[PDB]
Amino acid sequence: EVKLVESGGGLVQSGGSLRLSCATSGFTFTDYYMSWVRQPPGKALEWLGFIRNKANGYTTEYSPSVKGRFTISRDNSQSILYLQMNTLRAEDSATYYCARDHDGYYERFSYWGQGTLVTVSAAKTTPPSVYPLAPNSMVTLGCLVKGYFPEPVTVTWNSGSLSSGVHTFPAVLQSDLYTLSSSVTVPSSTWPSETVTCNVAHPASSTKVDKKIVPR
Amino acid sequence: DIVMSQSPSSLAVSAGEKVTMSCKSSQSLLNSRTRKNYLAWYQQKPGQSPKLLIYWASTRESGVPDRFTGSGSGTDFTLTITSVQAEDLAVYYCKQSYNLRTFGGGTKLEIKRADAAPTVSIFPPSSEQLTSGGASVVCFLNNFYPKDINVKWKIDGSERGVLNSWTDQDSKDSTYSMSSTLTLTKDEYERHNSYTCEATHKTSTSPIVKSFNRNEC
Ligand SMILES: C=CCO[C@]1(C=O)C[C@@H](O[C@]2(C(=O)O)C[C@@H](O)[C@@H](O)[C@@H]([C@H](O)CO)O2)[C@@H](O)[C@@H]([C@H](O)CO)O1
Ligand SMILES: [Mg+2]
Numbered sequence A: 001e002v003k004l005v006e007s008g009g010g011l012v013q014s015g016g017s018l019r020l021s022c023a024t025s026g027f028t029f030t031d032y033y034m035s036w037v038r039q040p041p042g043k044a045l046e047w048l049g050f051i052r053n054k055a056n057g058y059t060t061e062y063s064p065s066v067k068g069r070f071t072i073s074r075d076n077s078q079s080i081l082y083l084q085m086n087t088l089r090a091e092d093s094a095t096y097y098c099a100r101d102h103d104g105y106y107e108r109f110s111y112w113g114q115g116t117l118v119t120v121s122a123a124k125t126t127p128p129s130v131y132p133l134a135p136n137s138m139v140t141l142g143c144l145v146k147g148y149f150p151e152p153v154t155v156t157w158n159s160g161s162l163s164s165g166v167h168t169f170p171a172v173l174q175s176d177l178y179t180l181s182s183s184v185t186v187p188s189s190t191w192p193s194e195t196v197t198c199n200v201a202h203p204a205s206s207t208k209v210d211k212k213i214v215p216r
Numbered sequence B: 001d002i003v004m005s006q007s008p009s010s011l012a013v014s015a016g017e018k019v020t021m022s023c024k025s026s027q028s029l030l031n032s033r034t035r036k037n038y039l040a041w042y043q044q045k046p047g048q049s050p051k052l053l054i055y056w057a058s059t060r061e062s063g064v065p066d067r068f069t070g071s072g073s074g075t076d077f078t079l080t081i082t083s084v085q086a087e088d089l090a091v092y093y094c095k096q097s098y099n100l101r102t103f104g105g106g107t108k109l110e111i112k113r114a115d116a117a118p119t120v121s122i123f124p125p126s127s128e129q130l131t132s133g134g135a136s137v138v139c140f141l142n143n144f145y146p147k148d149i150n151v152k153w154k155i156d157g158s159e160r161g162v163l164n165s166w167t168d169q170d171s172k173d174s175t176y177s178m179s180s181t182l183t184l185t186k187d188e189y190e191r192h193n194s195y196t197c198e199a200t201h202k203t204s205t206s207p208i209v210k211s212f213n214r215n216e217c
């Protein structure tokens, strides 16, 4: 199975530098060009650059938008792709994806990573507060994940075993902090008799929280 | 340079109907040496990475449903979805690879469905929050259509620090959900008894009212 996994995203100040990585497996890495693409929240994809395959000498090309400022490189022993970013500004805040590119035949990006979020800001890292939301044949519970920076957070329920009936509401920025919420709806016959727990992570602050929803 | 433009910006279509969207390049994408059009289509569902659907303008990637068809040549390309399904909700991007690579601006496809009333739930502040000096009250308005909805907060019967957030459309039932959070200080929270969220949606001339009273907690 082909795997592409980006890492290195996070909070950085205006003018600073950051290097992203993209670990790959499941294909002959040196056979392929690799691209970097970014996407500001709610905006279009933007191609940034590629590094060619072995047959083409692993040479690089860049969008005019970032040429001179961003550098792509690759480790052909470990099959890892890199993106070095310099003199970062607010406009560089975006999800960054690596994508498998050309192999000398096909014109396509066959595979994409899950993406890593970069936030360029002067604001400090603030961990979320996580609060339980407790109150038919059906019952709705939730978790309020309040007052964190930067994005993202992840929310699962019962370590992912409850995914059906889950709605996670996109974060909203108010007074320099994000807040999000997540609802889960289960048969009333199963709660509180069975446990329901939201699992929240905030990678920027390495925060890991399990909040059991307890009847009031 | 190569400018990629897409149309429409967005549209909504009912399950089982045909979808048509277009992609224009500022230069022909027809490579004269290989005689193929270097134009691909990607689908990006909410919260996901883009996924390859079509390349060389008309070659459908393995595993991609037959309902997706790419067509066109030179400067104009079309992605057609026959008998659209609830799961096809996504932003669709075209991308040229004739000269480096450039993406179009995307077309957002939403799904039209029958009107559906929200299910509304209200949640009082937790003791773990109140201890800190804050008091957030939350209402979930779940599984409704269309997207437009009004929420009013009433405290002791009069209208009132509100954070509203809508989900992207659901991939299974084509509904929306919204969360509304009213945040007060603990001091202000303790001055009043009744907390009400009122949802008015086109599905009823009667607002859906959910309330709790602080004395009952
Ligand atoms: C324009 C340079 C020379 O053309 C080729 C001959 O086949 C193709 C080159 O591939 C690319 C490139 O690396 O720039 C990528 C590919 O996706 C496509 O955009 C083509 C474009 O259609 C031009 O052919 O360009 C590359 O193999 C190149 C080689 O580096 C030198 O011969 O050769
Ligand atoms: Mg739902």
Ligand SMILES: [Mg+2]
Pocket: B155, B156, B191, B192, B193
């Ligand atoms: Mg009062």
Ligand SMILES: [Zn+2]
Pocket: B188, B191, B192
């Ligand atoms: Zn008051």
